[PDB]
Structures are given as structure tokens and as C-alpha cells.
Amino acid sequence: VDKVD
Amino acid sequence: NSYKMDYPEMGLCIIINNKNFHKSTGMTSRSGTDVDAANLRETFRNLKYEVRNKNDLTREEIVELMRDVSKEDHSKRSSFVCVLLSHGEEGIIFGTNGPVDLKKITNFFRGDRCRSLTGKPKLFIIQACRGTELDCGIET
């Protein structure tokens, strides 16, 4: 799943 | 002109891969960052760079690493690559325990503070947030 840094 | 890339060594490629953060920070663990570090490591090996992966470094371990690298003798290397994989904000990279100013890291390699890299390309590749805005896009 796509996640933010 | 183009940079002289035929020194005996292409140079170093330091990869700082920060995945797990102290609960002090409120930072989620960064799943998938190991696939990045291994991908980077194989890519720069094919470019003939001496790669050094470093994992879960505190804000202090990062600083100490960078002066030590900038204190090395690069006289026989063509270039210098530094890859930072971490959380961040504008201007800031996070160690495991807290924030580091990016310009503190890169000042160690200023053309006056690191003579064996003067006139030589210094590449900093940063995978890290720079704020909290979202790009909604537009359909072309």
C-alpha cells in the first residue's frame, strides 16, 4: 500500500 | 565541458536508510525502504561506485558519518554520491531520534571544507517528505 514520507 | 569521470575510482555512494524511528518521534516505520536501499546499492555498483549502506542512524550518527566521509581523501575519486532515505520536512531529514538540517549535512562537502572534492560533482539524492501538501493532479 501507498504511504507518505 | 563535462566533468572528468576517469579518475581511478568513480567515488563513494553512501546510502543512509532509516526505517525504524524511536517512539519519541511519532514516526511510522517506513515499509518498503529496504527494497529502495538494495535497489540503489545494485545500481551504483553497476556504475562502479564503492557503496556503503548504513541503516537506522540517529541524527548524531548521521553528522558524525558525514564529517568522517568529508574528512576522507577523495583525491583519486571522480565524484561523491549521498542517498538519504527517511522522513523529512522542508530542509530537514530525520534521524531515528530526531531532525537534522539538510544544509548541515551538505556543508561538510563545501568546496572549501572538502578540498579533495573541489571541482567535483557532489550528488545528494533525497527520498523524504518536504511538507504536507498533496498534489491532486489535473487530467491532460
Binding site: 501507498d2 | 553497476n46 556504475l47 551538505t106 568546496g111 573541489t118 550528488l123 527520498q127
Partner: protein, 91 residues
């Protein structure tokens, strides 16, 4: 004499002020695309032209997928910051 800030290049995964996107299985959009473009073009292209293909690949080929609608269908453009004084060929 040269400037002490000359000959740096800063390849940012995303634009000033913005989130940067990473996928838990494949890695960050930026690093996937950087490594792919380097593998395919480091023998052919100047470095900034490589990073411009990285820009296009991240911009056109990735959108976020999120069960949270706030975070869903978002885009990303990287940000090449160059104080370099010459062209950079890895060959």
C-alpha cells in the same frame, strides 16, 4: 576561485512543500524510477537528461491508492536542484 556551493546537485523526490510517496512493497516512486532510468540510460544520456526522464516517469506512471480518500489518487513530481558547472556522464 570558484563558489564554495558550486558543483552540487540535489535530486529531490518531490517538490518543495509536498509529501513524498513510497509503496510498502515496491519502494519509493522516486527511487524505483531513478534506478530504472539509470539502468536503462546511464550508458547513453547526460545525467540531468536521465533525471528528467525520472521526472516524467514519476509524474505520469504513479498515482496514490489509499483507502483514505484524503490520500487517494495523488500525484508527485520530483525536483532537480543543480548547482553543477559541467555535464555529468557516467560513461
Amino acid at each position: 576561485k570558484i563558489p564554495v556551493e558550486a558543483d552540487f546537485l540535489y535530486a529531490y523526490s518531490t517538490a518543495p512543500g509536498y509529501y513524498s510517496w513510497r509503496n510498502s512493497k515496491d519502494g519509493s516512486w522516486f527511487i524505483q524510477s531513478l534506478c530504472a532510468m539509470l539502468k536503462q540510460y546511464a550508458d547513453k544520456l547526460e545525467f540531468m537528461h536521465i533525471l528528467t526522464r525520472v521526472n516524467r516517469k514519476v509524474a505520469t506512471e504513479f498515482e496514490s491508492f489509499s483507502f483514505d480518500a484524503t490520500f487517494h489518487a495523488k500525484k508527485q513530481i520530483p525536483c532537480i536542484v543543480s548547482m553543477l558547472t559541467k555535464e555529468l556522464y557516467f560513461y
